[PDB]
Write a protein that binds this ligand. Structure first.
Ligand code: 4BW
Ligand code: MG
Length: 92
RNA sequence: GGGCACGCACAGAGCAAACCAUUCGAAAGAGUGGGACGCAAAGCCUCCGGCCUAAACCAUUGCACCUCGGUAGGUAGCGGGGUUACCGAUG
């Protein structure tokens, strides 16, 4: 089920938080405007990220194009987030 | 680690449609060389089904109008099955 937020994993856990945020942005921006990028590095949130897109269409094109895309020597696995981000919920 | 499955990849490799040249073949087809349409077994095997050939050999003087003898050879890149094998996001 499509969503404003794409959930990304199989990411490289050795990339610092800010750098990962930046690059994630820098190549997910082409698909539309990015509300936020929530990244981290704790134990269960390790190696993974949420890119929050302003409208859904942008998240679908993103997932479609860069599924399996190898990123910092690892192939990104992209699904839709199961839940709306607090940002998006908060707008409504 | 092995062995079973799986193909959305990832990371190394492989094969080769059409066309042309050439060889084998009655033919359909096959080999070799060039060459890439695609292929997760498009590696290998006719056991089953399909489709293609049908010259020579044997049977057959037979009244059809849906087609219909044996025999033989093909297609594994038409399936099913059998058998060998790489990768790992996975039951
Ligand atoms: N090593 C491996 N990789 C696999 C396998 N199955 C799937 N994959 C991966 O999924 C890709 C696509 O599989 P496919 O069955 O749809 O298309 C395959 C298939 O159609 C074909 N192909 C490539 N190598 C092949 C081969 N050796 N045998 C048969 N088909 C092959 O081209 C695609 C393979 O490209 P690929 O190597 O970049 O990517 C595979 C590969 O990364 C597999 O059984 N082994
Ligand atoms: Mg060749």
């Amino acid at each position: 089920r499509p969503n404003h937020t794409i959930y990304i994993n199989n990411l490289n856990e050795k990339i610092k938080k800010d750098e990962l945020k930046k690059s994630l942005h820098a190549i997910f921006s082409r698909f539309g405007q990015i509300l936020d990028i929530l990244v981290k590095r704790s134990l269960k949130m390790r190696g993974q990220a949420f890119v929050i897109f302003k409208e859904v269409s942008s998240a679908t094109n993103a997932l479609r194009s860069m599924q399996g895309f190898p990123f910092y020597d690892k192939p990104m696995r992209i699904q839709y987030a199961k839940t709306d981000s607090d940002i998006i919920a908060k707008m409504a």
